Design a protein around this ligand. Sequence first.
Ligand SMILES: Nc1nc2c(ncn2[C@@H]2O[C@H](COP(=O)(O)OP(=O)(O)OP(=O)(O)O)[C@@H](O)[C@H]2O)c(=O)[nH]1
Ligand SMILES: Nc1nc2c(ncn2[C@@H]2O[C@H](COP(=O)(O)OP(=O)(O)OP(=O)(O)O)[C@@H](O)[C@H]2O)c(=O)[nH]1
Ligand SMILES: CC[C@H](C)[C@H](N)C(=O)O
Ligand SMILES: CC[C@H](C)[C@H](N)C(=O)O
Lengths: 168, 240
Amino acid sequence: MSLLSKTRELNTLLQKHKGIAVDFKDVAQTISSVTVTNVFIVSRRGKILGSSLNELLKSQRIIQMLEERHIPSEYTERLMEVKQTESNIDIDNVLTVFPPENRELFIDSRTTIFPILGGGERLGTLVLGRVHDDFNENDLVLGEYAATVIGMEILREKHSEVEKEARD
Amino acid sequence: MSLLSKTRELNTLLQKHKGIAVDFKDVAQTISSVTVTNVFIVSRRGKILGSSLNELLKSQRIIQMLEERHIPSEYTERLMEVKQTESNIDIDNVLTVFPPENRELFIDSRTTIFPILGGGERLGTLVLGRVHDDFNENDLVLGEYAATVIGMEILREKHSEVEKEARDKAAITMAINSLSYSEKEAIEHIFEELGEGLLIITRSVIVNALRKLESAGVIESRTFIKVKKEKFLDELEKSK
Ligand SMILES: Nc1nc2c(ncn2[C@@H]2O[C@H](COP(=O)(O)OP(=O)(O)OP(=O)(O)O)[C@@H](O)[C@H]2O)c(=O)[nH]1
Ligand SMILES: Nc1nc2c(ncn2[C@@H]2O[C@H](COP(=O)(O)OP(=O)(O)OP(=O)(O)O)[C@@H](O)[C@H]2O)c(=O)[nH]1
Ligand SMILES: CC[C@H](C)[C@H](N)C(=O)O
Ligand SMILES: CC[C@H](C)[C@H](N)C(=O)O
């Protein structure tokens, strides 16, 4: 499956989805599909806006995050410190999206972190994880596309509410 | 230069620009830079929303289009028949972005057409033109992405305009109903002295009237007081 074909899944979702707002659950599932990754889309404060997970659902810690609708405040803080795309992060790096208490299971895991920016502001983080294979530049194109477009969507959303708080 | 580097140049514009709105004139420059193309971004009716031209600036017709801010209605109509990306279009093809009457300059040229879609609707067209070299998959990855975000941005402007429409109607109504009959009359009299026009029936009323309007956002005040809803005057008179 060519890179062109992969980028088209995201473009198709953006072009043809209903409503003015793209659903980040849909976006997470599309990225998950074309990069074969566990996917988190999180807010500035680590609220889970969308996810699409496979192996990670076998972790009760992960499951609890999903119930709480937040990643851990510590991981959130560490994601906010990542200022540009950081890729192929290993299981011993605190930036891993995999639970370090399952080190043997995820020994070859790779994590890539995409800061989400819009309107010149940090609006969230896109996090992708694989149990095995390294990310390559094509994966990065897809990730940064996705991150850019999520950023446009959050930016529009927040300016809808900020100008509705400006009414007051 | 890698595709990743090209996408980042575009993404930097999208992520870091100022204002809520992406300026399509900037997008055309950036698309042109990372694909080495002559670029048109056009609306459904062929208005040029952004262009980045080089070799095409030689042609007099092109200069004329730029000055009218429109591509020809004929070509506009031809673009609207392209429903999928069509690439590497040559000079003797009706879809070329190059002027056929300058065939000799553009004999090896290639045109790619990218429909701009949003919310299940055609919103415009991104057109790329190169003098020499064929378009490859990198160019299409960049071009279809660019077209997608332009579509999102057109969709956002349109929606924000139907929104401002509804906000203003609601704002005018909310104010009008807050006015007593006297205040309505005072406001009419105010504009029988102001045709834009300055400050300076008793006094407490006229002031009370204008304060209800400033608070509903129908007028703003400075030494001076204007309407920023160009529809308030009619709706006022009709409310008596
Ligand atoms: N288009 C789109 N926007 C979303 C979606 N989910 C959340 N948002 C927007 O994303 C932004 C962040 O989500 P919030 O619900 O405010 O969560 P938060 O942690 O309080 O966000 P922060 O302001 O970063 O702290 C808000 O503007 C939401 O409106 C989604 O699925 N699609
Ligand atoms: N974000 C953004 N939107 C733009 C820009 N230029 C034009 N638009 C929007 O693109 C849409 C089409 O442009 P128009 O100015 O309406 O030209 P038109 O020929 O009347 O467009 P149509 O109604 O589609 O036929 C409008 O909703 C504009 O607001 C731009 O530079 N940035
Ligand atoms: C989603 C957070 C991940 C699992 C992080 N490495 C942690 O251990 O908390
Ligand atoms: C931009 C329009 C172009 C030049 C088209 N091929 C024409 O000849 O009109």
